[PDB]
């Protein structure tokens, strides 16, 4: 029987596409100041209504490593951190010959902070006065190859000019919701065991993505999403070991870090009308900064991770090992805490093995048992390359604590040798795309094509 | 079933459902072509892009003679070479999301056909209404 | 009086005048939705916001089947519980500016009713024009 | 009286302080209502409204 | 320096004290400048002090 071309509008058809996304904060992001936190500034208040919808009969390919959403997340955070450090004082009179004293601790288990003194251009310019401040040793370098052991320079002044972080802006991550613009939708893979690349046989759609914590961390993935049912691992090509592996935890591992030193702040004038905050005193006894992880949880967790790692390396058992070795910011686990930046030597954690042989947790003979990471503090920071990189994070008075949940690992295998039955894994921090990609894997942006043509038994009325 | 009562299908509820089910309650997709507010320059750009798109769709639909935003029967006869497939083959168990994979190749032909076929229509009314 | 001749009532002339007087010469309100040029980002924002509002109204009026920009008789039957008021009570001495205070509560019902009603309408023509 | 509180800047000589009159205009879709009563106190119903 | 011909120009060899990257510790540095880009500093008889 005869058919005619019949055109429909409002059709439910779409294609995957590239576009910008909005960012939306939770409702309580606007009682604060401008630029503090960035969630108040770049983003809009979100409306949780309408909630999620599940599509009953559709299947779609999801590809986490080809997702441009994280590629836009990177640019967003880069430009958003670059914006904040415009008005803040850009140091520069501190590129001078700092004369410093030896101090005395004689143990080596704890560091001291070097006491350095410098001639300051006062707020009336050409009437100098000598001033002193405490500097963490990683942020100070000797000035010259000469035998003078008492003349020092900041790690700045050789590579780039550097800027203080303002005190009225905080580093704490406010959750960020990425929302779609008009004519587009976000598809949520509801399959709770999805590995990362393949057809999701249960596809939902949501107005906006759930909140993302932009927490910067190198080796471990702090506060974030937890696996629904079991530990799942993700990697592009495990045969070529150079690719990063993302481990996603179901049961979190609790971590707490502290700085027991009771620091006290100090103020210095830098030209007219602006101040440079510094550390001036250490009240009480100097003590070591550290992080505490419960052995009872880590020992269970890493063999739980071992059974999952066994599947794509079934021929061989598993052992864990130290990082590849290198500079502090490359090798150590690092994070922010209250404004301070920590760098933890993590050799105690990544140690032990698994051979398909589970060891019991019950009864936990000592729940107070711990393994203590030892961490160092810095104030001169290279947080991203090319973001206007250097930032001086001012000290914070008192003593601070850093409790949080671990929810995943970033790893990289070492090269194989002897065809060994027990080849090993190493930690690997790196590009911050790998951090956000651990949490954006659920989503894909699509473009709605509501116009379509079909054959039908109806014709035009004349 | 399509006997919903007050519509609550959501935005893309009929995705994966039959062509007939998606053909009823088309307005839920049409009405939602709008969102957003502005930060900087990029989000305002995203706002105007949606208007560009909406007016592209509306103009292309209107040049064919379709002022209505849901369905039109058109004067263009069907060219059966495009599928040579049955009514039940296309209508009763497929969805629009899987229909678009087939005849999206031939959209650029049908668009020109409709564009000219409106002109073979409306010029004649310009004569008959003068004869009347 | 509404026997104006050439229209000169201005933008909001019939504000406070009768519903019937405001019902004639609706174009003087409708046509005034264009203005502006740009300083900075906020003025272009104000420009695009007007287009957004205009397309809101035009779309929402379109899905009801109203391509015309002035008046429509619609197929939705009247629900009299909303006022239970007479024709002279509503039409002869009220103005639109004080009519909006009453049934603005029930607009969100009538909108959905009209939206579904256009779909009961046009699906039938998709069958009748095939039977013809 | 600078140098203690903030840095300061000279006003350019090619810009003047004289108030040129400013008219605030409405965008499209909005209107400005002028209370035409010549004795209005500031808060209440204006019985003569212009636009 | 010495050219004495006038058919070719030389470049003037100029030297200066530089505020180095650690600010208040100067070192003298030199560079060649094309003559159109350099002017004598003052009307005084010193023929050895120049300004850009
Ligand atoms: C870091 O080095 C600075 C010097 O660059 C140390 O500051 C100096 O501390 C001493 C001891 O408190 C001060 O000496 C005392 O001054 C009072 C003034 O009333 C005087 O009565 C005492 O007889 C004694 O001389 C000294 O003034 C002070 N320097 C300055 C410039 O104020 C600082 O203590 C060092 N901190 C650490 C943790 O090593
Ligand atoms: C332009 O002027 C500069 C000086 O302002 C000239 O540089 C100077 O060149 C001389 C000759 O090469 C250097 O002297 C030599 O230094 C070595 C150091 O090891 C010494 O062993 C020699 O006995 C001799 O004294 C001098 O050091 C150098 N100046 C500096 C600051 O390095 C430059 O040659 C001039 N160029 C032209 C094209 O006129
Ligand atoms: C500064 O140090 C004190 C003492 O170590 C901290 O006080 C303890 O905080 C924990 C919570 O982490 C409580 O469970 C203890 O009861 C507190 N008192 C003691 C004696 O341990 C304090 O929290 C630290 N300051 C910050 C900001 O963390």
Short mmCIF file of N, CA and C in Angstrom, two decimals, chain A residues 1-15 18-23 41-45 53-60 72 76 79-80 83 179-187 205 207 446-462, chain B residues 8-17 19 22-23 26 29-30 32-37 39 42-43 46 49-50 53-54 57-58 60-61 64-66 68-78 82 85-87 90-91 96-97 99-100 103-104 107 110-111 114 117-118 121:
data_model
loop_
_atom_site.label_atom_id
_atom_site.label_comp_id
_atom_site.label_asym_id
_atom_site.label_seq_id
_atom_site.Cartn_x
_atom_site.Cartn_y
_atom_site.Cartn_z
N UNK A 1 0.84 -1.23 0.00
CA UNK A 1 0.00 0.00 0.00
C UNK A 1 0.86 1.26 0.00
N UNK A 2 0.32 2.34 -0.56
CA UNK A 2 1.10 3.55 -0.78
C UNK A 2 1.54 4.17 0.54
N UNK A 3 2.74 4.76 0.51
CA UNK A 3 3.30 5.46 1.65
C UNK A 3 3.81 6.82 1.18
N UNK A 4 3.91 7.76 2.12
CA UNK A 4 4.36 9.11 1.85
C UNK A 4 5.36 9.53 2.92
N UNK A 5 6.26 10.44 2.55
CA UNK A 5 7.23 10.94 3.52
C UNK A 5 6.50 11.85 4.50
N UNK A 6 6.59 11.51 5.79
CA UNK A 6 5.93 12.23 6.86
C UNK A 6 7.00 12.65 7.86
N UNK A 7 7.02 13.94 8.18
CA UNK A 7 8.09 14.55 8.97
C UNK A 7 7.57 14.82 10.37
N UNK A 8 8.37 14.45 11.37
CA UNK A 8 8.02 14.57 12.78
C UNK A 8 8.99 15.52 13.46
N UNK A 9 8.51 16.20 14.49
CA UNK A 9 9.30 17.09 15.32
C UNK A 9 9.08 16.73 16.78
N UNK A 10 10.13 16.87 17.58
CA UNK A 10 10.14 16.34 18.93
C UNK A 10 10.55 14.89 19.02
N UNK A 11 11.23 14.37 18.00
CA UNK A 11 11.61 12.95 17.97
C UNK A 11 12.64 12.68 19.06
N UNK A 12 12.63 11.50 19.74
CA UNK A 12 13.73 11.18 20.67
C UNK A 12 14.93 10.51 19.99
N UNK A 13 15.74 11.34 19.33
CA UNK A 13 16.96 10.90 18.65
C UNK A 13 18.08 11.85 19.05
N UNK A 14 19.29 11.33 19.16
CA UNK A 14 20.44 12.15 19.50
C UNK A 14 21.71 11.56 18.90
N UNK A 15 22.78 12.36 18.92
CA UNK A 15 24.12 11.93 18.57
C UNK A 15 25.10 12.50 19.58
N UNK A 18 30.37 17.45 20.94
CA UNK A 18 31.26 18.25 21.76
C UNK A 18 30.62 19.60 22.04
N UNK A 19 30.69 20.05 23.29
CA UNK A 19 30.15 21.34 23.66
C UNK A 19 30.67 21.71 25.04
N UNK A 20 30.51 22.99 25.38
CA UNK A 20 30.79 23.43 26.74
C UNK A 20 29.72 22.92 27.69
N UNK A 21 30.03 22.99 28.98
CA UNK A 21 29.09 22.66 30.04
C UNK A 21 29.08 23.77 31.07
N UNK A 22 27.92 23.97 31.70
CA UNK A 22 27.85 24.85 32.85
C UNK A 22 28.49 24.17 34.05
N UNK A 23 28.68 24.94 35.11
CA UNK A 23 28.99 24.41 36.43
C UNK A 23 28.00 24.99 37.41
N UNK A 41 31.64 31.71 42.33
CA UNK A 41 31.98 32.67 41.29
C UNK A 41 31.68 32.15 39.89
N UNK A 42 32.24 31.00 39.52
CA UNK A 42 32.09 30.50 38.16
C UNK A 42 30.76 29.79 37.94
N UNK A 43 30.00 29.52 39.00
CA UNK A 43 28.87 28.60 38.94
C UNK A 43 27.57 29.26 39.39
N UNK A 44 26.50 28.51 39.17
CA UNK A 44 25.11 28.93 39.33
C UNK A 44 24.54 28.08 40.46
N UNK A 45 23.54 28.53 41.23
CA UNK A 45 22.87 27.57 42.11
C UNK A 45 22.14 26.48 41.33
N UNK A 53 16.11 10.11 35.39
CA UNK A 53 15.18 9.30 34.62
C UNK A 53 15.94 8.14 34.01
N UNK A 54 15.33 6.96 34.01
CA UNK A 54 15.92 5.74 33.46
C UNK A 54 15.21 5.43 32.15
N UNK A 55 16.00 5.20 31.10
CA UNK A 55 15.48 4.87 29.78
C UNK A 55 15.41 3.35 29.66
N UNK A 56 14.25 2.85 29.23
CA UNK A 56 13.91 1.45 29.47
C UNK A 56 14.50 0.45 28.49
N UNK A 57 14.88 0.88 27.28
CA UNK A 57 15.20 -0.08 26.22
C UNK A 57 16.42 0.32 25.38
N UNK A 58 17.31 1.17 25.89
CA UNK A 58 18.40 1.73 25.10
C UNK A 58 19.73 1.25 25.67
N UNK A 59 20.69 1.05 24.76
CA UNK A 59 22.06 0.67 25.09
C UNK A 59 23.01 1.58 24.32
N UNK A 60 24.10 1.98 24.96
CA UNK A 60 25.02 2.95 24.37
C UNK A 60 26.45 2.66 24.80
N UNK A 72 37.70 19.33 29.50
CA UNK A 72 37.17 20.66 29.80
C UNK A 72 37.27 20.99 31.28
N UNK A 76 38.92 24.33 32.84
CA UNK A 76 38.11 25.11 33.78
C UNK A 76 38.88 25.38 35.06
N UNK A 79 42.02 27.79 34.38
CA UNK A 79 41.66 29.20 34.25
C UNK A 79 41.07 29.75 35.54
N UNK A 80 40.42 28.90 36.32
CA UNK A 80 39.74 29.34 37.53
C UNK A 80 40.72 29.58 38.67
N UNK A 83 42.69 32.82 37.61
CA UNK A 83 41.93 34.05 37.85
C UNK A 83 42.11 34.55 39.27
N UNK A 179 26.42 20.89 34.46
CA UNK A 179 25.09 20.85 33.87
C UNK A 179 25.21 21.05 32.37
N UNK A 180 24.23 20.53 31.64
CA UNK A 180 24.25 20.60 30.18
C UNK A 180 23.54 21.86 29.69
N UNK A 181 23.87 22.39 28.51
CA UNK A 181 23.08 23.49 27.95
C UNK A 181 21.87 22.97 27.20
N UNK A 182 21.11 23.91 26.65
CA UNK A 182 19.91 23.56 25.90
C UNK A 182 20.26 22.75 24.67
N UNK A 183 19.37 21.82 24.32
CA UNK A 183 19.56 20.98 23.16
C UNK A 183 20.48 19.80 23.38
N UNK A 184 21.05 19.65 24.58
CA UNK A 184 21.93 18.54 24.92
C UNK A 184 21.40 17.84 26.16
N UNK A 185 21.91 16.63 26.39
CA UNK A 185 21.58 15.85 27.58
C UNK A 185 22.82 15.09 28.03
N UNK A 186 22.81 14.68 29.30
CA UNK A 186 23.89 13.90 29.89
C UNK A 186 23.35 12.50 30.18
N UNK A 187 24.04 11.48 29.67
CA UNK A 187 23.64 10.09 29.86
C UNK A 187 24.47 9.47 30.98
N UNK A 205 19.42 9.23 32.28
CA UNK A 205 19.69 10.61 31.93
C UNK A 205 19.32 11.51 33.10
N UNK A 207 19.53 15.76 34.77
CA UNK A 207 19.65 17.18 34.46
C UNK A 207 21.09 17.66 34.64
N UNK A 446 25.46 14.36 24.92
CA UNK A 446 24.84 14.03 23.65
C UNK A 446 24.02 15.22 23.17
N UNK A 447 23.67 15.19 21.89
CA UNK A 447 22.99 16.28 21.21
C UNK A 447 21.69 15.79 20.58
N UNK A 448 20.57 16.39 20.98
CA UNK A 448 19.24 15.91 20.60
C UNK A 448 18.90 16.39 19.20
N UNK A 449 18.51 15.45 18.33
CA UNK A 449 18.14 15.75 16.94
C UNK A 449 16.64 15.50 16.80
N UNK A 450 15.79 16.50 17.06
CA UNK A 450 14.35 16.24 17.15
C UNK A 450 13.62 16.14 15.81
N UNK A 451 14.31 16.30 14.68
CA UNK A 451 13.68 16.37 13.37
C UNK A 451 13.97 15.09 12.60
N UNK A 452 12.91 14.43 12.14
CA UNK A 452 13.04 13.17 11.43
C UNK A 452 11.95 12.94 10.40
N UNK A 453 12.24 12.07 9.43
CA UNK A 453 11.33 11.78 8.32
C UNK A 453 11.08 10.28 8.30
N UNK A 454 9.83 9.90 8.02
CA UNK A 454 9.41 8.50 8.03
C UNK A 454 8.36 8.28 6.96
N UNK A 455 8.14 7.03 6.54
CA UNK A 455 7.05 6.75 5.60
C UNK A 455 5.73 6.50 6.33
N UNK A 456 4.64 6.98 5.74
CA UNK A 456 3.32 6.87 6.36
C UNK A 456 2.25 6.95 5.27
N UNK A 457 1.05 6.46 5.61
CA UNK A 457 -0.08 6.36 4.68
C UNK A 457 -0.87 7.67 4.51
N UNK A 458 -0.37 8.82 4.98
CA UNK A 458 -1.10 10.08 4.89
C UNK A 458 -0.36 11.05 3.99
N UNK A 459 -1.13 11.89 3.29
CA UNK A 459 -0.63 12.80 2.27
C UNK A 459 -1.10 14.22 2.59
N UNK A 460 -0.69 15.17 1.76
CA UNK A 460 -1.05 16.57 1.98
C UNK A 460 -2.50 16.82 1.59
N UNK A 461 -3.17 17.65 2.39
CA UNK A 461 -4.51 18.13 2.07
C UNK A 461 -4.41 19.39 1.22
N UNK A 462 -5.08 19.40 0.08
CA UNK A 462 -5.08 20.55 -0.82
C UNK A 462 -6.34 21.37 -0.58
N UNK B 8 3.98 12.00 32.27
CA UNK B 8 5.12 12.04 33.17
C UNK B 8 6.31 11.28 32.60
N UNK B 9 6.43 11.20 31.27
CA UNK B 9 7.49 10.41 30.65
C UNK B 9 8.87 11.01 30.87
N UNK B 10 8.96 12.30 31.18
CA UNK B 10 10.25 12.95 31.26
C UNK B 10 10.72 13.41 29.89
N UNK B 11 12.01 13.75 29.83
CA UNK B 11 12.56 14.32 28.60
C UNK B 11 12.64 13.28 27.49
N UNK B 12 13.46 12.24 27.69
CA UNK B 12 13.71 11.23 26.67
C UNK B 12 13.07 9.89 27.03
N UNK B 13 11.87 9.92 27.60
CA UNK B 13 11.28 8.70 28.14
C UNK B 13 11.04 7.63 27.09
N UNK B 14 10.63 8.04 25.89
CA UNK B 14 10.32 7.10 24.82
C UNK B 14 11.55 6.60 24.07
N UNK B 15 12.76 6.97 24.49
CA UNK B 15 13.96 6.45 23.86
C UNK B 15 14.04 4.95 24.06
N UNK B 16 14.19 4.21 22.97
CA UNK B 16 14.11 2.77 22.99
C UNK B 16 12.71 2.20 22.88
N UNK B 17 11.68 3.04 23.04
CA UNK B 17 10.30 2.60 22.89
C UNK B 17 9.88 2.68 21.43
N UNK B 19 8.04 3.42 17.77
CA UNK B 19 7.81 4.64 17.00
C UNK B 19 6.46 5.25 17.34
N UNK B 22 6.55 6.97 20.84
CA UNK B 22 7.28 8.22 20.77
C UNK B 22 6.56 9.27 19.93
N UNK B 23 5.75 8.85 18.97
CA UNK B 23 4.99 9.77 18.13
C UNK B 23 3.89 10.50 18.89
N UNK B 26 5.04 14.11 21.81
CA UNK B 26 6.28 14.69 21.28
C UNK B 26 6.66 15.99 21.96
N UNK B 29 9.78 16.58 24.42
CA UNK B 29 11.11 16.85 23.87
C UNK B 29 11.19 18.26 23.32
N UNK B 30 10.14 18.72 22.63
CA UNK B 30 10.19 20.01 21.96
C UNK B 30 10.30 21.15 22.96
N UNK B 32 11.68 21.47 25.85
CA UNK B 32 12.81 21.55 26.77
C UNK B 32 14.06 22.11 26.08
N UNK B 33 13.94 22.69 24.89
CA UNK B 33 15.13 23.19 24.19
C UNK B 33 15.64 24.51 24.77
N UNK B 34 15.84 24.59 26.09
CA UNK B 34 16.16 25.84 26.78
C UNK B 34 16.83 25.53 28.11
N UNK B 35 17.85 26.31 28.46
CA UNK B 35 18.57 26.14 29.72
C UNK B 35 19.61 27.24 29.86
N UNK B 36 20.00 27.51 31.10
CA UNK B 36 21.27 28.14 31.40
C UNK B 36 21.19 29.59 31.87
N UNK B 37 22.28 30.00 32.52
CA UNK B 37 22.57 31.40 32.80
C UNK B 37 24.08 31.57 32.69
N UNK B 39 28.07 33.01 33.02
CA UNK B 39 29.33 33.43 33.62
C UNK B 39 30.31 33.71 32.50
N UNK B 42 31.78 32.44 27.79
CA UNK B 42 31.51 31.13 27.18
C UNK B 42 30.07 30.69 27.41
N UNK B 43 29.51 30.95 28.59
CA UNK B 43 28.16 30.47 28.87
C UNK B 43 27.13 31.29 28.10
N UNK B 46 27.12 29.78 24.82
CA UNK B 46 26.29 28.57 24.84
C UNK B 46 24.81 28.91 24.80
N UNK B 49 23.95 29.90 21.17
CA UNK B 49 24.03 28.74 20.28
C UNK B 49 22.72 27.98 20.24
N UNK B 50 22.05 27.85 21.39
CA UNK B 50 20.76 27.18 21.44
C UNK B 50 19.72 27.90 20.60
N UNK B 53 20.35 27.23 16.97
CA UNK B 53 19.91 25.89 16.61
C UNK B 53 18.39 25.83 16.47
N UNK B 54 17.68 26.38 17.45
CA UNK B 54 16.22 26.34 17.46
C UNK B 54 15.66 27.04 16.23
N UNK B 57 16.19 24.89 13.08
CA UNK B 57 15.19 23.84 12.98
C UNK B 57 13.84 24.42 12.56
N UNK B 58 13.45 25.54 13.17
CA UNK B 58 12.15 26.12 12.86
C UNK B 58 12.08 26.61 11.42
N UNK B 60 13.92 25.55 8.80
CA UNK B 60 13.94 24.41 7.89
C UNK B 60 12.59 23.71 7.88
N UNK B 61 11.95 23.60 9.04
CA UNK B 61 10.64 22.97 9.10
C UNK B 61 9.58 23.82 8.42
N UNK B 64 9.36 23.89 4.50
CA UNK B 64 8.62 22.74 4.01
C UNK B 64 7.11 22.92 4.10
N UNK B 65 6.63 23.97 4.76
CA UNK B 65 5.21 24.18 4.98
C UNK B 65 4.70 23.72 6.33
N UNK B 66 5.58 23.39 7.27
CA UNK B 66 5.19 22.86 8.58
C UNK B 66 5.29 23.94 9.65
N UNK B 68 3.23 23.63 12.18
CA UNK B 68 2.98 22.83 13.37
C UNK B 68 4.24 22.15 13.85
N UNK B 69 4.40 22.07 15.17
CA UNK B 69 5.64 21.59 15.78
C UNK B 69 5.60 20.10 16.13
N UNK B 70 4.65 19.33 15.57
CA UNK B 70 4.56 17.91 15.91
C UNK B 70 4.63 16.94 14.72
N UNK B 71 3.70 17.02 13.75
CA UNK B 71 3.62 16.07 12.64
C UNK B 71 3.07 16.81 11.41
N UNK B 72 3.49 16.37 10.22
CA UNK B 72 2.94 16.85 8.96
C UNK B 72 2.85 15.71 7.97
N UNK B 73 1.71 15.59 7.29
CA UNK B 73 1.66 14.84 6.04
C UNK B 73 1.99 15.77 4.87
N UNK B 74 2.89 15.32 4.00
CA UNK B 74 3.50 16.16 2.97
C UNK B 74 3.13 15.65 1.58
N UNK B 75 3.23 16.55 0.60
CA UNK B 75 2.81 16.22 -0.76
C UNK B 75 3.80 15.30 -1.46
N UNK B 76 5.05 15.27 -1.02
CA UNK B 76 6.11 14.53 -1.70
C UNK B 76 5.78 13.04 -1.67
N UNK B 77 5.69 12.35 -2.81
CA UNK B 77 5.47 10.90 -2.75
C UNK B 77 6.71 10.17 -2.28
N UNK B 78 6.48 8.99 -1.71
CA UNK B 78 7.57 8.19 -1.16
C UNK B 78 8.38 7.54 -2.28
N UNK B 82 14.72 3.79 -1.01
CA UNK B 82 15.48 4.09 0.19
C UNK B 82 15.53 2.94 1.18
N UNK B 85 11.19 -1.47 2.59
CA UNK B 85 10.84 -2.20 3.80
C UNK B 85 9.37 -2.00 4.14
N UNK B 86 8.82 -2.95 4.89
CA UNK B 86 7.39 -2.99 5.15
C UNK B 86 7.02 -1.97 6.23
N UNK B 87 5.71 -1.76 6.40
CA UNK B 87 5.23 -0.85 7.43
C UNK B 87 5.52 -1.40 8.82
N UNK B 90 9.21 -1.13 9.89
CA UNK B 90 9.72 0.20 10.22
C UNK B 90 9.03 0.75 11.47
N UNK B 91 7.79 0.35 11.71
CA UNK B 91 6.90 1.06 12.61
C UNK B 91 6.65 0.37 13.94
N UNK B 96 12.75 5.42 17.13
CA UNK B 96 13.30 6.53 16.37
C UNK B 96 14.83 6.56 16.47
N UNK B 97 15.36 6.24 17.65
CA UNK B 97 16.80 6.23 17.88
C UNK B 97 17.52 5.22 17.00
N UNK B 99 15.83 4.12 14.05
CA UNK B 99 15.42 4.52 12.70
C UNK B 99 16.39 5.53 12.11
N UNK B 100 16.95 6.41 12.94
CA UNK B 100 17.82 7.46 12.42
C UNK B 100 19.11 6.92 11.80
N UNK B 103 17.92 6.12 7.38
CA UNK B 103 17.56 7.12 6.38
C UNK B 103 18.24 8.46 6.63
N UNK B 104 19.11 8.57 7.64
CA UNK B 104 19.91 9.78 7.80
C UNK B 104 20.80 10.03 6.59
N UNK B 107 18.57 12.12 4.10
CA UNK B 107 17.92 13.35 4.55
C UNK B 107 18.27 14.52 3.63
N UNK B 110 15.84 14.41 0.68
CA UNK B 110 14.45 14.68 1.04
C UNK B 110 14.27 16.15 1.40
N UNK B 111 15.29 16.77 1.99
CA UNK B 111 15.19 18.19 2.34
C UNK B 111 15.01 19.05 1.10
N UNK B 114 11.46 18.47 -0.35
CA UNK B 114 10.42 19.21 0.37
C UNK B 114 10.51 20.70 0.06
N UNK B 117 9.06 21.22 -3.31
CA UNK B 117 7.67 20.78 -3.34
C UNK B 117 6.73 21.74 -2.63
N UNK B 118 7.24 22.55 -1.70
CA UNK B 118 6.39 23.63 -1.19
C UNK B 118 6.16 24.71 -2.24
N UNK B 121 3.54 23.94 -4.65
CA UNK B 121 2.23 24.10 -4.04
C UNK B 121 1.78 25.56 -4.00
#
